[PDB]
Amino acid sequence: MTIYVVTPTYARLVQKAELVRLSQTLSLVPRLHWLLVEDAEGPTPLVSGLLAASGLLFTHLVVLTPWVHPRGVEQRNKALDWLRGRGGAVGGEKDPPPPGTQGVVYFADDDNTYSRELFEEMRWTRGVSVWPVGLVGGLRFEGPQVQDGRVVGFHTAWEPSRPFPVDMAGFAVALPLLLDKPNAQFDSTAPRGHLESSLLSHLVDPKDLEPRAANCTRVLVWHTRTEKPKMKQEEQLQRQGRGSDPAIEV
Amino acid sequence: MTIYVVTPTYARLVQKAELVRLSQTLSLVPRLHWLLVEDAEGPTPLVSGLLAASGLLFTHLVVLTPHPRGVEQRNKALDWLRGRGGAVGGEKDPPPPGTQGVVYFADDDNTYSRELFEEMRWTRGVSVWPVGLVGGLRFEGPQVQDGRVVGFHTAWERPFPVDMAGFAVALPLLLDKPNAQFDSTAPRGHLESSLLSHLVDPKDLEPRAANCTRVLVWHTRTEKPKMKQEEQLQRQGRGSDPAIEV
Numbered sequence: 001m002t003i004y005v006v007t008p009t010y011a012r013l014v015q016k017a018e019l020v021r022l023s024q025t026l027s028l029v030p031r032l033h034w035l036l037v038e039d040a041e042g043p044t045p046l047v048s049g050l051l052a053a054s055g056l057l058f059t060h061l062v063v064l065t066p067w068v069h070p071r072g073v074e075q076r077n078k079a080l081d082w083l084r085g086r087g088g089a090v091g092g093e094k095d096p097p098p099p100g101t102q103g104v105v106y107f108a109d110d111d112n113t114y115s116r117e118l119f120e121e122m123r124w125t126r127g128v129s130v131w132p133v134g135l136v137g138g139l140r141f142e143g144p145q146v147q148d149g150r151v152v153g154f155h156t157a158w159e160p161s162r163p164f165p166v167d168m169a170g171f172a173v174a175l176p177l178l179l180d181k182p183n184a185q186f187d188s189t190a191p192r193g194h195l196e197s198s199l200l201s202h203l204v205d206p207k208d209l210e211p212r213a214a215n216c217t218r219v220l221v222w223h224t225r226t227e228k229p230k231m232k233q234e235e236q237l238q239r240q241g242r243g244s245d246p247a248i249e250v
Numbered sequence: 251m252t253i254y255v256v257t258p259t260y261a262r263l264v265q266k267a268e269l270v271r272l273s274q275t276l277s278l279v280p281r282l283h284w285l286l287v288e289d290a291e292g293p294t295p296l297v298s299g300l301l302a303a304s305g306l307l308f309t310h311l312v313v314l315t316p317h318p319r320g321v322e323q324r325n326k327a328l329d330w331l332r333g334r335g336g337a338v339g340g341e342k343d344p345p346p347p348g349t350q351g352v353v354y355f356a357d358d359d360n361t362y363s364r365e366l367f368e369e370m371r372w373t374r375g376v377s378v379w380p381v382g383l384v385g386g387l388r389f390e391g392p393q394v395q396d397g398r399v400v401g402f403h404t405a406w407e408r409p410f411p412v413d414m415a416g417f418a419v420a421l422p423l424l425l426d427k428p429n430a431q432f433d434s435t436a437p438r439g440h441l442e443s444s445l446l447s448h449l450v451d452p453k454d455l456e457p458r459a460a461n462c463t464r465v466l467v468w469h470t471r472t473e474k475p476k477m478k479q480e481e482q483l484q485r486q487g488r489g490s491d492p493a494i495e496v
């Protein structure tokens with residue numbers, strides 16, 4: 001069962017650092033195909049270079065992002081388009097899996113923290129699977145309430161009106177189910193935190209969710225965020241004509 | 251050649267996450283021995299459990315520090331390497347005297363590429379390489395000329411203007427200098443120097459990373475999670491189950 005990890009990424013100071021630790025974590029997982037989608041005009045040397053050197057099975061994708069400020073929407077839908085045979089690769093495996101292929105799709109932002117155990121949990125998804133997510137929604141962890149092996153509620157707080165009050169990193173979807181539901185995609189016009197539900201509503205009813213991670217008692221992924229680097233000194237040095245050598249990638 | 255990674259850690263919301271992605275990166279490095287020292291009153295089940303399930307060669311140490319942080323913890327790892335014992339888990343026996351190896355001080359929130367470790371494995375005395383996103387710069391790094399450290403690309407004021415993550419020390423040199431340790435009273439920018447002045451002259455530093463032309467380690471920091479909601483649910487008697495580890 002191959003796991004397809006959809007990861008939208010964009011250039012900023014901590015980008016390479018984020019892709020380095022993430023790609024290194026992904027190299028621990030067998031049967032994993034990384035769909036890295038750059039939010040850029042075209043493929044960048046930085047990302048192309050990191051992928052080629054990663055040693056991972058991957059497909060490089062690119063799409064530009066054109067009030068609620070959703071992040072990575074277009075990039076995620078681009079990965080979905082590719083999976084549905086609408087092309088778009090610029091590197092790596094050019095052809096998507098043919099229909100009938102078994103597999104699971106997981107949307108992994110480039111700044112979260114993922115334990116290798118998480119991937120074995122989602123590898124057996126029939127429709128849509130779920131598990132708790134740490135340090136998200138303003139909670140220690142947000143996650144499905146499980147009873148008798150079934151989801152009967154949710155431990156959440158923010159925007160409780162959400163049919164699926166779970167984070168992007170808190171679920172995975174069966175590849176066959178995605179192809180069998182062509183209208184399933186992320187809605188960029190969706191309110192602040194209803195992005196997840198905009199995709200999932202086309203796939204299942206929350207009652208049909210497959211609880212994983214020891215019936216949602218284990219937190220195997222964390223919604224970590226990196227601090228924006230301090231650059232006051234870099235700014236001053238540049239004015240003096242001695243800024244950090246730009247020919248050295250960071 | 252074994253690499254001894256000394257990592258001080260402490261309990262806070264992101265600790266487990268930090269330790270998870272750090273240990274996963276380390277499991278990609280051969281001949282590596284992890285010296286994880288907790289800044290706590292005793293071994294925490296969280297860390298003990300993470301170490302046991304990591305499949306890494308490690309030694310677990312503890313020491314509480316009631317201003318530069320993680321200092322006492324790093325010094326205890328050094329004490330252990332000097333046969334002064336102090337382990338509470340993992341490999342209790344330190345490397346025998348005259349053992350070859352290199353010591354690297356890796357904070358638990360930085361980002362380290364696998365290549366970094368292969369660069370430091372050749373350390374004779376003390377080696378150096380650039381560090382990204384640190385000191386207010388895209389990167390700080392030694393200035394190399396003819397394969398010799400002739401200066402330092404830095405902004406903040408120091409005999410050794412390099413971050414904790416930008417150097418490694420040969421094990422034999424550390425044993426040879428029994429007084430070489432971090433000064434817990436040394437202010438932030440002088441912590442690295444308090445140790446290195448006991449070991450070598452900055453002009454004897456061995457430049458790595460293609461003569462310091464590549465950034466293989468980043469000084470990333472993790473945002474503190476907002477917990478307003480947790481506090482609200484706590485008032486209502488339904489906070490995140492304390493029995494579910496995060």
Ligand SMILES: *O=P([O])([O])OP([O])(=O)O[C][C]1O[C](N2[C]=[C]C(=O)[N]C2=O)[C]([O])[C]1[O]
Nearest residue numbers: 007008009010039071072075109110111225
């Ligand atoms: O605030 P969050 O932490 O939920 O979101 P994020 O910052 O981690 O963004 C989500 C994903 O999309 C990427 N992205 C962000 C901003 C942008 O302009 N373009 C993007 O592709 C980012 O790398 C994440 O993977």
Ligand SMILES: *O=P([O])([O])OP([O])(=O)O[C][C]1O[C](N2[C]=[C]C(=O)[N]C2=O)[C]([O])[C]1[O]
Nearest residue numbers: 258259260289319320323356357358359471
């Ligand atoms: O500000 P920096 O990013 O240089 O430092 P840090 O926050 O990453 O701390 C350095 C190391 O020491 C640990 N530590 C931190 C605070 C404390 O009270 N006790 C500690 O042991 C931390 O985990 C880092 O590894």
Ligand SMILES: OC[C@H]1O[C@@H](O[C@@H]2[C@@H](O)[C@H](O)O[C@H](CO)[C@@H]2O)[C@H](O)[C@@H](O)[C@H]1O
Nearest residue numbers: 136137138158165166167168192193479
């Ligand atoms: O499942 C949680 C949900 O959180 C949304 O983000 C919210 C923020 O927009 C708001 O400012 O704070 C909230 C916490 O009180 C919460 O973090 C995400 O948009 C969504 O993806 C999901 O993570």
Ligand SMILES: [Mn+2]
Nearest residue numbers: 109111112225
């Ligand atoms: Mn994020």
Ligand SMILES: [Mn+2]
Nearest residue numbers: 357359360471
């Ligand atoms: Mn740090």
